[PDB]
Protein backbone atom coordinates (compact mmCIF):
# COMPACT_ATOMS: atom_id res chain seq x y z
CA UNK A 1 0.00 0.00 0.00
CA UNK A 2 1.67 3.18 -1.21
CA UNK A 3 1.73 5.91 1.43
CA UNK A 4 0.81 9.31 0.01
CA UNK A 5 3.01 12.18 1.21
CA UNK A 6 2.69 15.97 1.21
CA UNK A 7 4.20 16.15 -2.29
CA UNK A 8 0.94 14.44 -3.40
CA UNK A 9 -1.15 17.21 -1.82
CA UNK A 10 0.96 19.74 -3.77
CA UNK A 11 0.94 18.10 -7.25
CA UNK A 12 -1.50 15.21 -7.23
CA UNK A 13 -1.57 15.24 -11.06
CA UNK A 14 2.05 14.09 -11.34
CA UNK A 15 1.31 11.15 -9.08
CA UNK A 16 -1.78 10.28 -11.03
CA UNK A 17 0.02 10.33 -14.39
CA UNK A 18 2.69 8.09 -12.88
CA UNK A 19 0.11 5.66 -11.52
CA UNK A 20 -2.17 5.74 -14.56
CA UNK A 21 0.78 4.93 -16.83
CA UNK A 22 1.08 1.62 -14.95
CA UNK A 23 -2.60 0.87 -14.31
CA UNK A 24 -5.98 2.15 -13.21
CA UNK A 25 -6.27 0.85 -9.62
CA UNK A 26 -3.60 1.32 -6.99
CA UNK A 27 -3.71 0.55 -3.31
CA UNK A 28 -2.83 3.70 -1.44
CA UNK A 29 -2.99 5.23 2.04
CA UNK A 30 -3.35 8.73 3.25
CA UNK A 31 -0.68 10.06 5.59
CA UNK A 32 -1.10 8.85 9.15
CA UNK A 33 -1.83 12.30 10.43
CA UNK A 34 -4.74 13.03 8.20
CA UNK A 35 -7.47 13.54 10.76
CA UNK A 36 -10.06 10.85 9.99
CA UNK A 37 -9.02 8.77 7.03
CA UNK A 38 -5.35 8.68 7.86
CA UNK A 39 -3.63 5.42 7.42
CA UNK A 40 -6.55 3.74 5.90
CA UNK A 41 -5.85 1.48 2.96
CA UNK A 42 -7.90 2.26 -0.16
CA UNK A 43 -7.88 1.75 -3.88
CA UNK A 44 -7.13 4.87 -5.89
CA UNK A 45 -8.70 4.88 -9.30
CA UNK A 46 -6.94 6.60 -12.12
CA UNK A 47 -8.36 7.16 -15.59
CA UNK A 48 -11.44 8.68 -17.27
CA UNK A 49 -13.06 5.54 -18.58
CA UNK A 50 -12.43 3.73 -15.34
CA UNK A 51 -13.42 6.68 -13.12
CA UNK A 52 -16.56 7.57 -15.09
CA UNK A 53 -17.67 3.93 -15.16
CA UNK A 54 -16.83 3.46 -11.46
CA UNK A 55 -18.85 6.52 -10.40
CA UNK A 56 -22.04 4.98 -11.79
CA UNK A 57 -21.14 1.34 -11.19
CA UNK A 58 -24.01 -0.34 -9.29
CA UNK A 59 -21.51 -2.48 -7.35
CA UNK A 60 -19.81 0.54 -5.71
CA UNK A 61 -21.84 1.92 -2.79
CA UNK A 62 -21.54 5.17 -0.85
CA UNK A 63 -23.65 3.86 2.04
CA UNK A 64 -22.57 5.25 5.41
CA UNK A 65 -23.30 1.84 6.94
CA UNK A 66 -20.98 0.18 4.42
CA UNK A 67 -18.25 2.82 4.78
CA UNK A 68 -18.49 2.42 8.56
CA UNK A 69 -16.09 -0.53 8.24
CA UNK A 70 -13.47 1.75 6.66
CA UNK A 71 -13.63 4.49 9.31
CA UNK A 72 -14.00 2.09 12.27
CA UNK A 73 -10.36 1.09 11.71
CA UNK A 74 -9.43 4.56 13.04
CA UNK A 75 -12.43 5.54 15.18
CA UNK A 76 -15.08 2.94 16.12
CA UNK A 77 -17.36 5.70 17.44
CA UNK A 78 -19.74 6.50 14.60
CA UNK A 79 -20.19 10.10 15.80
CA UNK A 80 -16.46 10.91 16.19
CA UNK A 81 -15.61 10.78 12.48
CA UNK A 82 -15.63 14.42 11.56
CA UNK A 83 -17.83 15.22 8.66
CA UNK A 84 -18.40 11.52 8.44
CA UNK A 85 -19.92 11.40 11.87
CA UNK A 86 -23.37 9.79 11.59
CA UNK A 87 -25.08 12.88 13.03
CA UNK A 88 -23.74 14.87 10.05
CA UNK A 89 -23.20 12.42 7.16
CA UNK A 90 -26.52 10.49 7.06
CA UNK A 91 -27.64 12.20 3.86
CA UNK A 92 -28.40 11.42 0.21
CA UNK A 93 -24.77 11.23 -0.92
CA UNK A 94 -24.03 8.51 1.66
CA UNK A 95 -27.00 6.37 0.82
CA UNK A 96 -27.95 3.87 -1.78
CA UNK A 97 -30.93 4.02 -4.08
CA UNK A 98 -34.06 3.28 -2.14
CA UNK A 99 -33.33 6.03 0.40
CA UNK A 100 -31.24 8.24 -1.85
CA UNK A 101 -34.27 8.84 -3.95
CA UNK A 102 -36.45 9.89 -1.03
CA UNK A 103 -33.79 12.13 0.43
CA UNK A 104 -33.03 13.85 -2.88
CA UNK A 105 -36.72 14.46 -3.63
CA UNK A 106 -37.07 16.67 -0.56
CA UNK A 107 -34.82 19.33 -2.11
CA UNK A 108 -34.33 18.56 -5.81
CA UNK A 109 -37.03 20.98 -7.00
CA UNK A 110 -35.27 23.91 -5.28
CA UNK A 111 -31.87 23.26 -6.92
CA UNK A 112 -33.32 22.88 -10.42
CA UNK A 113 -31.70 24.72 -13.34
CA UNK A 114 -34.86 26.80 -13.78
CA UNK A 115 -35.11 27.47 -10.03
CA UNK A 116 -31.50 28.65 -9.64
CA UNK A 117 -31.86 31.12 -12.52
CA UNK A 118 -34.36 33.13 -10.46
CA UNK A 119 -31.54 33.99 -8.02
CA UNK A 120 -29.33 35.76 -10.59
CA UNK A 121 -30.24 39.28 -9.34
CA UNK A 122 -29.41 38.45 -5.70
CA UNK A 123 -26.13 36.72 -6.62
CA UNK A 124 -25.03 39.66 -8.77
CA UNK A 125 -25.95 41.98 -5.90
CA UNK A 126 -23.88 39.98 -3.40
CA UNK A 127 -20.93 39.73 -5.81
CA UNK A 128 -20.83 43.50 -6.36
CA UNK A 129 -20.96 44.24 -2.63
CA UNK A 130 -18.32 41.72 -1.71
CA UNK A 131 -15.76 43.14 -4.06
CA UNK A 132 -16.55 46.65 -3.13
CA UNK A 133 -16.26 45.95 0.55
CA UNK A 134 -12.60 44.86 0.60
CA UNK A 135 -9.55 47.13 1.10
CA UNK A 136 -7.31 48.81 -1.47
CA UNK A 137 -3.88 47.27 -0.92
CA UNK A 138 -1.17 45.60 -2.96
CA UNK A 139 -2.02 42.14 -1.54
CA UNK A 140 -5.76 41.51 -1.25
CA UNK A 141 -5.97 37.73 -0.59
CA UNK A 142 -8.89 37.35 -2.99
CA UNK A 143 -9.58 33.88 -1.58
CA UNK A 144 -10.61 35.08 1.89
CA UNK A 145 -11.98 38.46 0.79
CA UNK A 146 -14.05 37.19 -2.16
CA UNK A 147 -13.90 33.45 -2.87
CA UNK A 148 -14.94 32.15 0.56
CA UNK A 149 -17.81 34.60 1.37
CA UNK A 150 -19.64 34.42 -1.98
CA UNK A 151 -20.96 30.81 -1.93
CA UNK A 152 -21.80 30.88 1.78
CA UNK A 153 -23.71 34.15 1.38
CA UNK A 154 -25.66 32.62 -1.52
CA UNK A 155 -26.27 29.35 0.35
CA UNK A 156 -27.42 31.19 3.49
CA UNK A 157 -29.93 33.04 1.30
CA UNK A 158 -31.33 29.73 0.06
CA UNK A 159 -31.45 28.19 3.54
CA UNK A 160 -32.59 31.18 5.49
CA UNK A 161 -29.60 32.25 7.53
CA UNK A 162 -28.63 35.92 8.34
CA UNK A 163 -25.07 37.11 8.87
CA UNK A 164 -17.87 31.33 11.55
CA UNK A 165 -18.58 29.03 8.61
CA UNK A 166 -15.22 29.61 6.90
CA UNK A 167 -13.17 28.39 9.88
CA UNK A 168 -15.54 25.46 10.50
CA UNK A 169 -15.40 23.99 7.00
CA UNK A 170 -11.63 24.56 7.04
CA UNK A 171 -11.34 22.45 10.18
CA UNK A 172 -13.51 19.77 8.72
CA UNK A 173 -11.93 19.54 5.29
CA UNK A 174 -8.40 20.51 5.98
CA UNK A 175 -7.76 20.16 9.64
CA UNK A 176 -4.49 20.66 11.38
CA UNK A 177 -5.21 18.09 13.97
CA UNK A 178 -7.72 15.45 14.59
CA UNK A 179 -8.77 17.56 17.62
CA UNK A 180 -9.34 20.56 15.36
CA UNK A 181 -11.76 18.65 13.11
CA UNK A 182 -13.42 16.88 16.05
CA UNK A 183 -13.91 20.30 17.67
CA UNK A 184 -15.49 21.71 14.50
CA UNK A 185 -17.62 18.58 14.15
CA UNK A 186 -19.12 19.00 17.62
CA UNK A 187 -19.70 22.70 17.01
CA UNK A 188 -21.55 21.96 13.76
CA UNK A 189 -24.10 19.52 15.21
CA UNK A 190 -24.51 22.05 18.02
CA UNK A 191 -25.12 24.93 15.61
CA UNK A 192 -27.33 22.92 13.25
CA UNK A 193 -29.50 21.77 16.15
CA UNK A 194 -29.91 25.37 17.31
CA UNK A 195 -30.81 26.48 13.79
CA UNK A 196 -33.48 23.78 13.49
CA UNK A 197 -35.12 24.93 16.76
CA UNK A 198 -35.01 28.50 15.44
CA UNK A 199 -37.04 27.28 12.44
CA UNK A 200 -39.54 25.37 14.59
CA UNK A 201 -40.06 28.24 17.05
CA UNK A 202 -40.41 30.87 14.29
CA UNK A 203 -41.44 29.32 10.95
CA UNK A 204 -40.11 30.94 7.77
CA UNK A 205 -40.12 30.18 4.03
CA UNK A 206 -36.91 28.54 2.82
CA UNK A 207 -35.43 25.15 1.98
CA UNK A 208 -34.44 24.46 5.60
CA UNK A 209 -37.85 25.46 6.96
CA UNK A 210 -39.56 23.42 4.24
CA UNK A 211 -37.35 20.51 5.29
CA UNK A 212 -38.42 20.95 8.92
CA UNK A 213 -42.06 20.86 7.79
CA UNK A 214 -41.37 17.67 5.81
CA UNK A 215 -40.10 16.13 9.07
CA UNK A 216 -42.83 17.20 11.49
CA UNK A 217 -45.97 17.54 9.36
CA UNK A 218 -45.26 14.77 6.85
CA UNK A 219 -42.67 12.48 8.53
CA UNK A 220 -40.81 12.27 5.22
CA UNK A 221 -37.50 12.51 7.09
CA UNK A 222 -35.68 11.27 10.17
CA UNK A 223 -34.08 13.58 12.72
CA UNK A 224 -30.54 12.45 11.90
CA UNK A 225 -31.25 12.76 8.17
CA UNK A 226 -32.65 16.27 8.72
CA UNK A 227 -29.50 17.48 10.50
CA UNK A 228 -27.23 15.72 7.99
CA UNK A 229 -29.18 17.18 5.05
CA UNK A 230 -28.65 20.67 6.48
CA UNK A 231 -24.94 19.89 6.87
CA UNK A 232 -24.72 18.52 3.33
CA UNK A 233 -26.47 21.56 1.87
CA UNK A 234 -24.34 23.93 3.97
CA UNK A 235 -20.84 22.44 3.81
CA UNK A 236 -21.42 20.58 0.54
CA UNK A 237 -21.84 23.79 -1.39
CA UNK A 238 -19.28 25.97 0.34
CA UNK A 239 -15.80 24.45 0.00
CA UNK A 240 -16.52 23.42 -3.60
CA UNK A 241 -17.38 26.78 -5.14
CA UNK A 242 -14.75 28.84 -3.27
CA UNK A 243 -11.96 26.70 -4.70
CA UNK A 244 -13.55 26.95 -8.16
CA UNK A 245 -13.15 30.72 -7.98
CA UNK A 246 -9.71 30.30 -6.41
CA UNK A 247 -8.44 27.57 -8.75
CA UNK A 248 -9.87 29.28 -11.82
CA UNK A 249 -8.44 32.68 -10.88
CA UNK A 250 -4.97 31.23 -10.29
CA UNK A 251 -4.89 29.51 -13.69
CA UNK A 252 -6.26 32.66 -15.33
CA UNK A 253 -3.55 34.76 -13.65
CA UNK A 254 -0.90 32.38 -15.04
CA UNK A 255 -2.24 32.70 -18.61
CA UNK A 256 -3.07 36.39 -18.96
CA UNK A 257 -3.91 36.22 -22.67
CA UNK A 258 -6.74 33.78 -21.92
CA UNK A 259 -7.77 35.97 -18.99
CA UNK A 260 -8.04 39.05 -21.23
CA UNK A 261 -9.71 37.03 -24.00
CA UNK A 262 -12.47 36.55 -21.43
CA UNK A 263 -12.54 40.28 -20.67
CA UNK A 264 -12.74 40.91 -24.42
CA UNK A 265 -15.47 38.28 -25.12
CA UNK A 266 -17.83 37.26 -22.39
CA UNK A 267 -19.56 34.51 -24.32
CA UNK A 268 -16.53 32.35 -23.46
CA UNK A 269 -17.17 32.63 -19.70
CA UNK A 270 -19.55 29.61 -19.45
CA UNK A 271 -17.17 27.32 -21.31
CA UNK A 272 -14.18 28.73 -19.43
CA UNK A 273 -15.79 27.80 -16.10
CA UNK A 274 -16.10 24.16 -17.17
CA UNK A 275 -12.44 24.27 -18.22
CA UNK A 276 -11.52 25.50 -14.74
CA UNK A 277 -13.55 22.61 -13.33
CA UNK A 278 -11.74 20.12 -15.56
CA UNK A 279 -8.21 21.46 -15.07
CA UNK A 280 -8.25 22.11 -11.30
CA UNK A 281 -11.20 20.21 -9.88
CA UNK A 282 -12.29 21.61 -6.49
CA UNK A 283 -12.70 17.98 -5.41
CA UNK A 284 -9.76 15.82 -6.46
CA UNK A 285 -11.64 12.76 -5.14
CA UNK A 286 -15.23 11.58 -4.82
CA UNK A 287 -16.59 10.05 -1.62
CA UNK A 288 -15.32 6.66 -0.56
CA UNK A 289 -17.20 3.76 -2.12
CA UNK A 290 -17.42 0.15 -0.98
CA UNK A 291 -17.34 -2.90 -3.23
CA UNK A 292 -20.51 -4.95 -2.69
CA UNK A 293 -19.08 -7.83 -4.76
CA UNK A 294 -15.88 -8.75 -6.57
CA UNK A 295 -15.28 -6.48 -9.54
CA UNK A 296 -12.45 -5.70 -11.93
CA UNK A 297 -11.27 -2.13 -12.50
CA UNK A 298 -8.86 -1.93 -15.39
CA UNK A 299 -6.89 -5.18 -15.14
CA UNK A 300 -6.90 -5.51 -11.33
CA UNK A 301 -9.46 -7.40 -9.26
CA UNK A 302 -11.15 -5.49 -6.43
CA UNK A 303 -12.44 -7.91 -3.77
CA UNK A 304 -15.84 -7.51 -2.16
CA UNK A 305 -15.76 -5.27 0.90
CA UNK A 306 -12.74 -3.20 -0.09
CA UNK A 307 -12.91 0.57 -0.31
CA UNK A 308 -12.29 2.69 -3.38
CA UNK A 309 -11.38 6.37 -3.90
CA UNK A 310 -12.25 7.92 -7.27
CA UNK A 311 -9.71 10.49 -8.51
CA UNK A 312 -11.86 12.98 -10.43
CA UNK A 313 -8.78 15.09 -11.19
CA UNK A 314 -7.09 12.06 -12.75
CA UNK A 315 -10.07 11.44 -15.03
CA UNK A 316 -10.30 15.14 -15.95
CA UNK A 317 -6.66 15.20 -17.12
CA UNK A 318 -6.61 11.84 -18.93
CA UNK A 319 -4.96 12.19 -22.38
CA UNK A 320 -7.10 9.36 -23.79
CA UNK A 321 -10.09 11.70 -23.27
CA UNK A 322 -8.65 15.24 -23.28
CA UNK A 323 -5.92 16.63 -25.53
CA UNK A 324 -3.31 18.78 -23.79
CA UNK A 325 -4.87 17.78 -20.44
CA UNK A 326 -2.49 19.91 -18.33
CA UNK A 327 -2.96 23.10 -20.38
CA UNK A 328 -5.70 25.63 -19.70
CA UNK A 329 -7.74 26.31 -22.85
CA UNK A 330 -10.92 28.29 -22.20
CA UNK A 331 -12.09 27.57 -25.75
CA UNK A 332 -11.90 23.87 -25.29
CA UNK A 333 -14.83 21.73 -26.20
CA UNK A 334 -17.06 21.58 -23.20
CA UNK A 335 -18.73 18.59 -21.73
CA UNK A 336 -17.17 15.44 -20.48
CA UNK A 337 -15.72 16.65 -17.27
CA UNK A 338 -16.52 14.59 -14.20
CA UNK A 339 -15.97 17.38 -11.70
CA UNK A 340 -19.64 17.08 -10.67
CA UNK A 341 -19.52 13.27 -10.72
CA UNK A 342 -21.55 10.83 -12.78
CA UNK A 343 -24.56 8.64 -12.05
CA UNK A 344 -27.32 9.01 -9.48
CA UNK A 345 -25.11 11.16 -7.21
CA UNK A 346 -24.39 13.84 -9.83
CA UNK A 347 -24.07 17.11 -7.94
CA UNK A 348 -27.41 18.71 -7.09
CA UNK A 349 -25.81 22.14 -6.67
CA UNK A 350 -24.30 22.04 -10.16
CA UNK A 351 -26.69 24.66 -11.65
CA UNK A 352 -26.13 26.91 -8.62
CA UNK A 353 -22.33 26.59 -8.77
CA UNK A 354 -22.21 27.30 -12.52
CA UNK A 355 -24.28 30.46 -12.11
CA UNK A 356 -22.18 31.48 -9.10
CA UNK A 357 -18.96 31.06 -11.10
CA UNK A 358 -20.30 32.90 -14.16
CA UNK A 359 -21.46 35.93 -12.16
CA UNK A 360 -18.36 36.16 -9.96
CA UNK A 361 -15.86 35.87 -12.82
CA UNK A 362 -17.85 38.25 -15.03
CA UNK A 363 -17.85 40.95 -12.36
CA UNK A 364 -14.15 40.29 -11.68
CA UNK A 365 -13.43 40.98 -15.35
CA UNK A 366 -15.55 44.16 -15.29
CA UNK A 367 -14.05 45.33 -11.98
CA UNK A 368 -10.27 45.03 -11.52
CA UNK A 369 -9.71 43.85 -15.13
CA UNK A 370 -5.95 44.44 -14.75
CA UNK A 371 -5.51 42.51 -11.52
CA UNK A 372 -2.42 40.32 -11.22
CA UNK A 373 -0.91 37.76 -8.88
CA UNK A 374 1.08 39.36 -6.06
CA UNK A 375 3.55 36.51 -5.75
CA UNK A 376 5.26 34.04 -7.95
CA UNK A 377 3.00 31.21 -8.86
CA UNK A 378 5.29 28.66 -7.31
CA UNK A 379 5.26 29.91 -3.77
CA UNK A 380 1.56 29.21 -3.62
CA UNK A 381 0.60 26.29 -1.57
CA UNK A 382 -2.28 23.99 -1.49
CA UNK A 383 -4.09 22.82 1.57
CA UNK A 384 -4.01 19.39 3.06
CA UNK A 385 -7.21 17.61 2.28
CA UNK A 386 -8.16 14.07 1.33
CA UNK A 387 -10.84 15.30 -1.10
CA UNK A 388 -10.50 19.10 -1.50
CA UNK A 389 -8.18 20.95 -3.89
CA UNK A 390 -7.84 24.54 -2.70
CA UNK A 391 -5.22 27.17 -1.97
CA UNK A 392 -4.12 28.50 1.40
CA UNK A 393 -4.34 32.05 0.01
CA UNK A 394 -4.58 33.96 -3.28
CA UNK A 395 -2.87 37.36 -3.02
CA UNK A 396 -3.51 39.68 -5.96
CA UNK A 397 -3.00 43.33 -6.90
CA UNK A 398 -5.96 45.17 -8.42
CA UNK A 399 -5.15 48.84 -9.18
C1 LIG B 1 -17.64 23.61 -8.05
C2 LIG B 1 -18.73 23.23 -7.37
C3 LIG B 1 -19.06 21.77 -6.98
C4 LIG B 1 -18.41 20.62 -7.27
C5 LIG B 1 -17.12 20.41 -8.10
C6 LIG B 1 -19.14 19.53 -6.65
C7 LIG B 1 -18.80 18.20 -6.72
C8 LIG B 1 -19.61 17.13 -6.38
C9 LIG B 1 -19.37 15.74 -6.71
C10 LIG B 1 -18.15 15.22 -7.49
C11 LIG B 1 -20.38 15.01 -6.22
C12 LIG B 1 -20.52 13.48 -6.32
C13 LIG B 1 -19.58 12.82 -5.32
C14 LIG B 1 -19.61 11.32 -5.50
O15 LIG B 1 -20.36 10.83 -6.38
O16 LIG B 1 -18.86 10.62 -4.77
C17 LIG B 1 -21.30 15.92 -5.55
C18 LIG B 1 -22.47 15.58 -4.91
C19 LIG B 1 -23.31 16.46 -4.27
N20 LIG B 1 -23.12 17.83 -4.16
FE21 LIG B 1 -21.67 18.94 -5.06
N22 LIG B 1 -20.23 20.05 -5.99
C23 LIG B 1 -20.22 21.42 -6.16
C24 LIG B 1 -21.15 22.31 -5.66
C25 LIG B 1 -22.21 21.97 -4.86
C26 LIG B 1 -23.16 22.90 -4.27
C27 LIG B 1 -23.09 24.43 -4.48
C28 LIG B 1 -24.06 22.17 -3.56
C29 LIG B 1 -25.28 22.63 -2.71
C30 LIG B 1 -25.55 23.90 -2.40
C31 LIG B 1 -23.69 20.77 -3.69
C32 LIG B 1 -24.34 19.70 -3.12
C33 LIG B 1 -24.17 18.37 -3.44
C34 LIG B 1 -25.06 17.27 -3.09
C35 LIG B 1 -26.37 17.41 -2.29
C36 LIG B 1 -24.56 16.14 -3.59
C37 LIG B 1 -25.18 14.72 -3.44
C38 LIG B 1 -26.02 14.40 -4.67
C39 LIG B 1 -26.62 13.02 -4.58
O40 LIG B 1 -26.18 12.22 -3.72
O41 LIG B 1 -27.53 12.71 -5.39
N42 LIG B 1 -22.57 20.69 -4.48
N43 LIG B 1 -20.79 17.20 -5.68
C1 LIG C 1 -16.91 14.07 -1.72
C2 LIG C 1 -18.07 14.95 -1.35
C3 LIG C 1 -18.92 15.33 -2.31
C4 LIG C 1 -20.09 16.23 -2.02
C5 LIG C 1 -20.04 16.81 -0.61
O6 LIG C 1 -19.60 15.82 0.32
C7 LIG C 1 -18.26 15.42 0.07
C8 LIG C 1 -17.88 14.35 1.09
O9 LIG C 1 -17.32 16.46 0.27
C10 LIG C 1 -17.70 17.80 -0.04
C11 LIG C 1 -17.35 18.68 1.16
C12 LIG C 1 -16.56 19.92 0.72
C13 LIG C 1 -16.63 17.90 2.27
C14 LIG C 1 -15.42 17.30 2.31
C15 LIG C 1 -14.44 17.26 1.17
C16 LIG C 1 -15.04 16.59 3.55
C17 LIG C 1 -13.79 16.17 3.69
C18 LIG C 1 -13.30 15.42 4.86
O19 LIG C 1 -14.16 14.91 5.74
C20 LIG C 1 -11.83 15.26 5.05
C21 LIG C 1 -11.05 14.74 6.18
O22 LIG C 1 -11.60 14.41 7.29
C23 LIG C 1 -9.56 14.67 5.98
N24 LIG C 1 -9.45 15.15 4.58
C25 LIG C 1 -10.70 15.42 4.09
O26 LIG C 1 -10.86 15.88 2.90
C27 LIG C 1 -19.15 18.04 -0.48
C28 LIG C 1 -19.14 18.73 -1.83
Q: Is the CB of 182 under 6 A from ligand 2?
A: no
Which residues are CB-contacts of 377 (< 8 A; sequence separation ≥ 6)?
250, 253, 254
DSSP 343: S
Method by which the coordinates were obtained: X-ray
Q: Where are the beta strands (DSSP E) in the chain?
A: 2-3, 25-29, 42-45, 60-61, 289-291, 295-297, 300-302, 307-310, 372-373, 396-397
**Which CATH number fits the domain that encloses residue 201?**
1.10.630.10
100 is in an annotated binding site: yes
Give the number of domains in the chain: 1
**Residue 333 burial by CB count (10 A; 0-12/13-18/19+): exposed, middle or buried?**
exposed
Q: How far apart are CA 175 and CA 165, in angstroms?
A: 14
Instruction: Give the pairing of strands 2-3 and 25-29.
Output: parallel
> Within a 10 A sphere around the Cβ of 110, how many other Cβ atoms?
17
Structural domain for 14, as ranges = 2-397
Q: What angle do CA 86, 54, 175 make, to 5 degrees?
A: 40
Which has the closest alpha carbon to 131: 256, 233, 277, 249? 249
User: Dihedral (C-alpha) 192, 196, 202, 205: value to the nearest 10 degrees?
Assistant: 90
- Residue 203 has, within 13 A of its CA and on its CB side, a CA count of 7
Q: Which atom of ligand 2 is nearest to the CA of 287?
A: 1
Q: Helix, strand or coil for residue 308?
A: strand
Q: Is the CB of 93 under 6 A from ligand 2?
A: yes
Which of 51, 100, 174, 283 to mutate for ligand 2's pocket (most ligand atoms within 8 Å of CB)?
283
Amino acid sequence: PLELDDAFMQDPHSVYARLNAEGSAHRVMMPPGVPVCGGLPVWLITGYEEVRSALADPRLSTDLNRTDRLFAQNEPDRNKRGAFSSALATHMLHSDPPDHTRLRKLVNKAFTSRAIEKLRPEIEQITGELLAALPDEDPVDLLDAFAFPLPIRVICLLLGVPLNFKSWSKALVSGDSPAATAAASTAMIEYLGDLIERKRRTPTDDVLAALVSARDVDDRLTETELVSMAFLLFIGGHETTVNTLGNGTLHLMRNLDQWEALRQDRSLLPGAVEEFLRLESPLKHATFRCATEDLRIGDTAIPAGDFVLLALASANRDPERFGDPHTLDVRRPTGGHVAFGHGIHYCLGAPLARMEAQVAFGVLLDTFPAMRLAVDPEDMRWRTSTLIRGLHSLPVRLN
